[PDB]
Design a protein around this ligand. Structure first.
Ligand SMILES: CO[C@H]1O[C@H](CO)[C@@H](O)[C@H](O)[C@@H]1O
Ligand SMILES: CO[C@H]1O[C@H](CO)[C@@H](O)[C@H](O)[C@@H]1O
Lengths: 110, 110
């Protein structure tokens, strides 16, 4: 999967991927990093500032990283209209937050 | 991949997928269908109305299906602000168009 939809989280050790070389991972050392063939090309730069961290996209558009103590250690501070948003690792290698909802099939949640 | 970002297209025979059972495919018979373990649960219902069709998400949020003659055979008619949007097949099985851009890492296009 290469997307994370609000209000869900990307937990420790998990990542979004766009084959065959792009990997955006919420690391165990709390750093949120984008790797391109093993080389980091973007990151929140929060490694070592915690452990058991998780990345969460909120229904208002704000993207945050919580540590094990459930405290905010990093955020985009993009607080907008209450609705639903999505975080996407694109094939063009850009990582983007889009929202609010423009249209939906209604085939989910299911 | 489970997303399509404007202004790109999902060409004939190609699809978005969220393992292990969700498949949203732009079919060769021009139908845009969402399959759940082989069973269609949502579709544009445009099968047989063309061939060599492609699905395109526009930078204004409008989602369209063009036939081989490059004519519109189906669309969401969601014309909004000029920017960038994304179409996503979610793990909750919903298919959603989100936009405009809220935040970006700027790690792409690259
Ligand atoms: C109501 O919430 C559901 O539907 C909206 C679109 O209407 C999606 O954005 C969201 O992720 C869920 O699938
Ligand atoms: C300028 O276009 C690029 O950046 C925007 C976000 O700023 C993305 O939405 C788009 O798909 C491209 O990656």
């Amino acid at each position: 999967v290469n997307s994370l939809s609000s209000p869900n989280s990307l937990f420790t050790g998990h990542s979004l991927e766009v084959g065959p070389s792009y990997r955006l991972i919420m690391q165990g050392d709390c750093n949120f990093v984008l790797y391109d063939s093993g080389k980091p090309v973007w990151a929140s730069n929060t490694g070592g500032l915690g452990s058991g961290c998780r990345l969460t996209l909120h229904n208002n558009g704000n993207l945050v990283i919580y540590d094990q103590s459930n405290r905010v250690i990093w955020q985009t501070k993009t607080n907008g209209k209450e609705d639903h948003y999505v975080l996407v690792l694109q094939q063009d290698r850009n990582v983007v937050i889009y929202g609010p909802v423009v249209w939906a099939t209604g085939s989910g949640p299911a």
